[PDB]
Design an enzyme around this catalytic site. Structure first.
Site, PDB file in Angstrom:
ATOM      1  N   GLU A 196      -7.693  -0.851   0.179  1.00 20.92           N
ATOM      2  CA  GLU A 196      -6.540  -0.975   1.081  1.00 20.92           C
ATOM      3  C   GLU A 196      -5.439   0.076   0.903  1.00 20.92           C
ATOM      4  O   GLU A 196      -5.033   0.401  -0.210  1.00 20.92           O
ATOM      5  CB  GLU A 196      -5.861  -2.333   0.837  1.00 20.92           C
ATOM      6  CG  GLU A 196      -6.573  -3.505   1.512  1.00 20.92           C
ATOM      7  CD  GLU A 196      -6.084  -4.859   1.006  1.00 20.92           C
ATOM      8  OE1 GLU A 196      -4.830  -5.148   1.051  1.00 20.92           O
ATOM      9  OE2 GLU A 196      -6.925  -5.709   0.536  1.00 20.92           O
ATOM     10  N   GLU A 235      -9.402  -6.180   9.057  1.00 23.19           N
ATOM     11  CA  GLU A 235      -7.966  -6.474   8.931  1.00 23.19           C
ATOM     12  C   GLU A 235      -7.118  -5.773  10.001  1.00 23.19           C
ATOM     13  O   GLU A 235      -5.883  -5.857   9.989  1.00 23.19           O
ATOM     14  CB  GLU A 235      -7.479  -6.047   7.559  1.00 23.19           C
ATOM     15  CG  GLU A 235      -7.942  -7.005   6.460  1.00 23.19           C
ATOM     16  CD  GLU A 235      -7.104  -6.898   5.202  1.00 23.19           C
ATOM     17  OE1 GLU A 235      -6.162  -6.027   5.140  1.00 23.19           O
ATOM     18  OE2 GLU A 235      -7.336  -7.677   4.207  1.00 23.19           O
ATOM     19  N   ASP A 254      -4.449  -9.729  -8.395  1.00 22.67           N
ATOM     20  CA  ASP A 254      -5.126 -10.518  -7.373  1.00 22.67           C
ATOM     21  C   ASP A 254      -6.347 -11.228  -7.948  1.00 22.67           C
ATOM     22  O   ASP A 254      -6.278 -12.400  -8.317  1.00 22.67           O
ATOM     23  CB  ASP A 254      -5.531  -9.629  -6.197  1.00 22.67           C
ATOM     24  CG  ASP A 254      -6.293 -10.387  -5.127  1.00 22.67           C
ATOM     25  OD1 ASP A 254      -6.315 -11.636  -5.179  1.00 22.67           O
ATOM     26  OD2 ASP A 254      -6.873  -9.733  -4.234  1.00 22.67           O
ATOM     27  N   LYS A 301      -2.715 -16.109  -3.000  1.00 22.28           N
ATOM     28  CA  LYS A 301      -3.667 -16.613  -2.024  1.00 22.28           C
ATOM     29  C   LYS A 301      -3.926 -18.102  -2.234  1.00 22.28           C
ATOM     30  O   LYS A 301      -4.626 -18.477  -3.175  1.00 22.28           O
ATOM     31  CB  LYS A 301      -4.990 -15.851  -2.100  1.00 22.28           C
ATOM     32  CG  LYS A 301      -4.892 -14.370  -1.777  1.00 22.28           C
ATOM     33  CD  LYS A 301      -6.070 -13.608  -2.364  1.00 22.28           C
ATOM     34  CE  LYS A 301      -6.521 -12.487  -1.442  1.00 22.28           C
ATOM     35  NZ  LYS A 301      -7.542 -11.617  -2.088  1.00 22.28           N
ATOM     36  N   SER A 310      -9.185 -11.688   4.060  1.00 17.58           N
ATOM     37  CA  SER A 310      -9.819 -10.814   5.041  1.00 17.58           C
ATOM     38  C   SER A 310     -10.349 -11.613   6.227  1.00 17.58           C
ATOM     39  O   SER A 310     -10.332 -11.145   7.365  1.00 17.58           O
ATOM     40  CB  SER A 310     -10.949 -10.014   4.392  1.00 17.58           C
ATOM     41  OG  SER A 310     -11.852 -10.865   3.709  1.00 17.58           O
TER      42      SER A 310
HETATM   43  O1  2PG Z   1      -8.383  -8.389  -1.781  1.00 18.98           O
HETATM   44  C1  2PG Z   1      -7.479  -8.778  -1.034  1.00 18.98           C
HETATM   45  O2  2PG Z   1      -6.325  -8.393  -1.238  1.00 18.98           O
HETATM   46  C2  2PG Z   1      -7.780  -9.767   0.096  1.00 18.98           C
HETATM   47  C3  2PG Z   1      -6.729  -9.615   1.198  1.00 18.98           C
HETATM   48  O3  2PG Z   1      -6.764  -8.280   1.713  1.00 18.98           O
HETATM   49  O4  2PG Z   1      -9.077  -9.505   0.632  1.00 18.98           O
HETATM   50  P1  2PG Z   1     -10.223 -10.619   0.598  1.00 18.98           P
HETATM   51  O5  2PG Z   1      -9.618 -11.887   1.359  1.00 18.98           O
HETATM   52  O6  2PG Z   1     -11.489 -10.156   1.172  1.00 18.98           O
HETATM   53  O7  2PG Z   1     -10.352 -11.056  -0.930  1.00 18.98           O
HETATM   54 MG    MG Z   2     -11.418 -10.053  -2.682  1.00 18.90          MG
HETATM   55 MG    MG Z   3      -6.679  -7.817  -3.132  1.00 18.66          MG
END
Ligand code: 2PG
Ligand code: MG
Ligand code: MG
Ligand code: 2PG
Ligand code: CL
Ligand code: K
Ligand code: MG
Ligand code: MG
Lengths: 436, 430
Positions: free
Chosen positions: B162, B205, B314, B339, B369
């Site tokens: 990203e 995204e 994350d 999240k 995502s």
């Molecule tokens: O890694 C991330 O930051 C998330 C949100 O962009 O992606 P994903 O939901 O695929 O884990």
């Molecule tokens: Mg991920």
């Molecule tokens: Mg992430």
């Protein structure tokens, strides 16, 4: 009583500003958002933009919003028309503007108030929106008819970067028994399509156009339709999934000819097709693939080509830019027998009332009606309730990707659940869904 | 009084099924939808059916069943006060009885958790963000509005996943969003001009995904976009490396998309850090997420020693107070990517944010995502006063729905809200 009417700027699915309206009654606050087209017909009601190049790429809707808040709002609040009376509401709004093409206030100023009023009415009445819209349109509710989703799973034309001229390649799971089944099947075909597209034309082919379809850089329809027929087979839904096209041919109609490479600046004018020649290519396509509907095969004012083609088409022929949801232009198309289906896009004409009239006129002439999104959509789900209210039996609100499309498809899930045994899935009867 | 709990399948932004929950009280029916990642190995269990003959094996019948068949009747019998989010989620958590919510599934429990808080707001007759502030004991005088981190470019030849832009230079969220949208459109125009028409078609995204070789080329492109839009100096950059994606045999492969990637040219933790530092020196980057793998604690800690910008956890922490406590212990990061569906309940998510804030951490509320029309995180980021959110590019309405909700919240709050802007990292402390 309508205590308040308020408009703000919000963002559509392409990240461009559009008009959101909030209508406040004692029943609460009711919100509608105006969509925005890319392949807009020349005859569509005015979408008012600021054209301030320094803001929003010149795509501001400050003026439209101001027209709501400074013009429509105080007059509407003062009048306090029965929201249940959609005709008078739209009556009022249209008269406030006082022009044919809604060029004084803008269609994107009026539509939000029009739609929000109908949401407020439904609440007042203690009924689902689709029920109230059924009432508005004098449509049968016993049973309701649920629409076949036409899923634009492969995007071309002005909706996706690439050579492909034709705008939309849709699958329509008419062989399904419920909407829920149809949506599952459609998603499975879409995913199989995504995988095959990546393999066949590269990973980058799997990225999506504005309406959530995969966007392979391919030159011909026949190449697109192979991918989809292969996908349908791979998902193992052979014979239960048909195909639909939106050519949006107005986007490549030039010099009385049709440019099937119109996105190439160096396109060969030698290989531009005549009406006849184009009619030939379609008929070949119709012969090779299970296509049951074709939209805008010829240009928004190419009346003769429509009439001649329709004579011998034998499938559903949808007018979009030809009719721009305008009861006036629908009368012409009916007279000339140019088509037998209307694409209903409310922001083409700018009120719910006018949109319901267009539907009623079409149905009366033995037309079908496909309710439609725009390529610029929002989290608004109004057309899900609309297509059910109007009992049309067919809608097109995107691929099963990007949630400005799923929002509508999800809402249709919920409605089908609510309606239970008081609904039928239009399936193979989509064309005349209203007559079910 | 809760008189029904109900779940159905609906479809996320990628056309995969997910769990939608409706909770019914005397105030009406309240709806929450569960997002889905494309996921850390330590995430609470997303339960999928694995029926190859249905939904590509991605059905959520079992999770839906778990809501309707197991949670629903018990919840109603329990006569729970939805105003008490703690009592709600303790019940849920208890009912499943497993650490990682593998009995009933994270995607069965979270919907109930979120719907309850919506029901609670209605009972109190307050806006959701206000209730969430109350739940989290956050200050509301003023509220703090988030800086949007907008995912305008994606990778993953170029190994970094990203590339986001953050209009910290804006004075309001509304101005932030406009600036963000302008940069995004200018970037899209430049991309098609430079990499071909097809390169303009968006990813999951809503960001563009041109075939780019190096991070620098991706950042230069974004810098050009910011300049073209005329917002140079007002827009910063954020990165989500998702390094676990290219973490192999104790090394990191920047060319992990090449089957014959020169294994000899795979980087050590200290080596990768060297790359980031060079990038950080040359570009306006103010945030980097998952720069190292989800259990490579030593690599995080080492980097953190010398890093001078926000470092977001994350996959490392997966919104889990137990792992966040470790991360704090180890000085691995100084911001949490929140999240909700990574831990499974609102209460644990709020607990994670509170632990973070108490340790001087920042908190970036985040989408997945695979998103929906659900806008919970918009109200959540304001409720928690974090000052920063990442919920997609300004395209595809599973992203716009959130950013639009923030417009409305900002308008509603008027003078009782500030835009975090440059101060996003400690937004809560504003
Ligand atoms: O890694 C991330 O930051 C998330 C949100 O962009 O992606 P994903 O939901 O695929 O884990
Ligand atoms: Mg991920
Ligand atoms: Mg992430
Ligand atoms: O042409 C169409 O049928 C519409 C709906 O897909 O697209 P656009 O709103 O871009 O005109
Ligand atoms: Cl602090
Ligand atoms: K227990
Ligand atoms: Mg069009
Ligand atoms: Mg059309």
């Amino acid at each position: 009583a309508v205590s308040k009417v308020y408009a703000r700027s919000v963002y559509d699915s392409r990240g461009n500003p559009t008009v959101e309206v909030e209508l406040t009654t004692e029943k609460g606050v009711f919100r509608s958002i105006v969509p925005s087209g890319a392949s807009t017909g020349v005859h569509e009601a005015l979408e008012m933009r600021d054209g301030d190049k320094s803001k929003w790429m010149g795509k501001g809707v400050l003026h439209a919003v101001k027209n709501v808040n400074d013009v429509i709002a105080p007059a509407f609040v003062k009048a306090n028309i029965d929201v249940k009376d959609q005709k008078a509401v739209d009556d009022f709004l249209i008269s406030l503007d006082g022009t044919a093409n809604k060029s004084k206030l803008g269609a994107n100023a009026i539509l939000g108030v029009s739609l929000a009023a109908s949401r407020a009415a439904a609440a007042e009445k203690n009924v689902p929106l689709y029920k109230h819209l059924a009432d508005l349109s004098k449509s049968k509710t016993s049973p309701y008819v649920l629409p076949v989703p036409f899923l634009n799973v492969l995007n071309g034309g002005s909706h996706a970067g690439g050579a492909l001229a034709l705008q939309e390649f849709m699958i329509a799971p008419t062989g399904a028994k419920t909407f829920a089944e149809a949506l599952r099947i459609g998603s499975e075909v879409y995913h199989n399509l995504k995988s095959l597209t990546k393999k066949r034309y590269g990973a980058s082919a799997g990225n999506v156009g504005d309406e959530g379809g995969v966007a392979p850089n391919i030159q011909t329809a026949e190449e697109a339709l192979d991918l989809i027929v292969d996908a349908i087979k791979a998902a193992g839904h052979d014979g239960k999934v048909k195909i639909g096209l939106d050519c949006a041919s107005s986007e490549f109609f030039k010099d009385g000819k049709y440019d099937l490479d119109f996105k190439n600046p160096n396109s060969d004018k030698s290989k531009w097709l005549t009406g006849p020649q184009l009619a030939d290519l379609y008929h070949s396509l119709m012969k090779r693939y299970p296509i049951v509907s074709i939209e805008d095969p010829f240009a928004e004012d190419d009346w003769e080509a429509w009439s001649h083609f329709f004579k011998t088409a034998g499938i559903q022929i949808v007018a979009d830019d030809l009719t721009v949801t305008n009861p006036k232009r629908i009368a012409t198309a009916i007279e000339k027998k140019a088509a037998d289906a209307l694409l209903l896009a409310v922001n083409q004409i700018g009120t719910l009332s006018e949109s319901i009239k267009a539907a009623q006129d079409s149905f009366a002439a033995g037309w079908g009606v496909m309710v439609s999104h725009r390529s610029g959509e929002t989290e608004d789900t109004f057309i899900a309730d609309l297509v059910v209210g109007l009992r049309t039996g067919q809608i097109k609100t995107g691929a099963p990707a990007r949630s400005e499309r799923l929002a509508k498809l999800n809402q249709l899930l919920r409605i089908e659940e609510e309606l239970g045994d008081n609904a039928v899935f239009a399936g193979e009867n989509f064309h005349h869904g209203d007559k079910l």
